[PDB]
Design a protein around this ligand. Structure first.
Ligand code: HEM
Length: 406
């Protein structure tokens, strides 16, 4: 029963965690779990409170929460000295998603020149051409495995464009990020930045190589590389899962497919409801830096506090009929799939646009989008497989059929 189930290890929760999330939230929106001392936050306003409070809640354990174990034994009402003494031992410690003030602002600032309205405008117009190139690769087949054939390559190539990767290198980025890929990425971007710093150009990489911190100082090369290359890890898998979740609904809800085809202005609301219903980041964790209180629960220093963004997005105090996929939700943009606070996803706007542009050209070029029944069974008895992880919500594969429009 849910009373002793282990959210982090039990495979019975991978297909659909929301019955379990509902059971937790009805006990309390802030609940101490039966294992590992983890406090699980399934409430929307309580998750918001946690996210906005960096003084009490550190990102050192953001990725995995109780795994791996802390690199120290927590004691006392303050673990800040212990966090500082082992800062470089948490997973992804080199990336901004695990950083607290004052390190966090400096690392995040390096992204700023990539996310200007001018840059995102050029990247958005690029997405229209990229969507057609990706669809060219398999449209004639009338079927595809959507993750490997569209969603993962598309998400990779968008970030490559955003980072100003030279055109002649983009194919290699798709292959390698589709051999240690992280080291390959570091080596490639190290040389990019070193080259642009010695001979500046009128390109995106030079704008990256000449960025300054908020205090005016110049970042080290390794710090530019860490901030820039992290966009692939942060933006590839999550965005791929969102595109595929959108397609799954398009096939399982032909009524919605019909409405979107005839009124393209409903596509943004469809992508937002996809983010609310199938939030790609399933858990997002924090470490209590001091003794504190959320949702009326006394949380000791060193306790893992785990936000479940998909559960907060089904909090009935905020979303009426929260298990219903609805294009009509006036507050759908209030979901927290991209979190809140200083770590609020900088790729939120990018992911929304990837979803809208992808589905625009998908609907243009694919008539009669359907789920493959040989692979997934009938429409009211589907056989889907979700990734066996407690941190991410996404399909492992999605086989679809369609009539090419050309
Ligand atoms: C559906 C797609 C996506 C989802 C659901 C998502 C979700 C999230 C969430 C919840 C966080 C906050 C983690 C925390 O509490 O620290 C985050 C952070 C971040 N995301 Fe995304 N993300 C998506 C796509 C992207 C894209 C496309 C990019 C870049 C092109 C990106 C880059 C980042 C970065 C750099 C951070 C670190 C922010 C910081 O620590 O200040 N993500 N993401």
């Amino acid at each position: 029963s849910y009373e002793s189930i282990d959210f982090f290890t039990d495979p019975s929760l991978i297909p659909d965690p929301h019955p379990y999330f509902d059971y937790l939230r009805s006990q309390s929106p802030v609940l101490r779990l039966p294992q590992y001392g983890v406090v699980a936050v399934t409430g929307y306003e309580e998750a918001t409170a946690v996210y906005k409070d960096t003084d009490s809640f550190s990102n050192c354990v953001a990725l995995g929460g109780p795994f791996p174990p802390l690199p120290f034994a927590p004691n006392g009402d303050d673990v800040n000295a212990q966090i500082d003494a082992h800062r470089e031992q948490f997973p992804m410690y080199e990336h901004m998603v695990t950083m607290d003030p004052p390190e966090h602002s400096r690392a995040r600032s390096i992204l700023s020149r990539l996310l200007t309205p001018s840059r995102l405008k050029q990247n958005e117009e690029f997405m229209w051409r990229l969507a057609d190139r990706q669809l060219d690769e398999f449209l004639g087949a009338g079927e595809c495995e959507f993750i490997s054939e569209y969603a993962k390559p598309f998400a990779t190539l968008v970030i490559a464009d955003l980072l100003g990767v030279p055109e002649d290198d983009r194919k290699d980025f798709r292959v390698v990020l589709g051999v240690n890929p992280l080291q390959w990425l570091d080596d490639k971007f190290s040389a990019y930045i070193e080259d642009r710093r010695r001979q500046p150009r009128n390109d995106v990489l030079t704008a990256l190589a000449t960025a300054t911190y908020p205090d005016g100082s110049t970042p080290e090369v390794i710090d530019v590389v860490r901030s820039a290359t992290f966009l692939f890890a942060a933006g590839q898998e999550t965005t791929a899962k969102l595109l595929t979740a959108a397609m799954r609904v398009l096939g399982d809800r032909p009524d919605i497919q019909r409405r979107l085809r005839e009124n393209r202005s409903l596509i943004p609301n469809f992508i937002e409801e996809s983010l609310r219903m199938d939030s790609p980041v399933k858990s997002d964790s924090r470490l209590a830096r001091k003794r504190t209180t959320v949702g009326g629960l006394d949380i000791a220093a060193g306790t893992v506090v785990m936000v479940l963004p998909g559960a907060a997005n089904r909090d009935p105090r905020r979303f009426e009929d929260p298990h219903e996929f609805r294009l009509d939700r006036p507050n759908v943009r209030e979901h927290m799939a991209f979190a809140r606070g200083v770590h609020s996803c900088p790729g939120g706007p990018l992911a929304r646009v990837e979803g809208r542009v992808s589905l625009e050209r998908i609907l243009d070029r694919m008539l009669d989008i359907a789920i493959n029944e040989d692979r997934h069974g009938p429409a009211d008895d589907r056989r889907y497989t979700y990734e066996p992880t407690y941190i991410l919500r996404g399909l492992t594969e999605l086989h679809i059929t369609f009539t090419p429009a050309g």
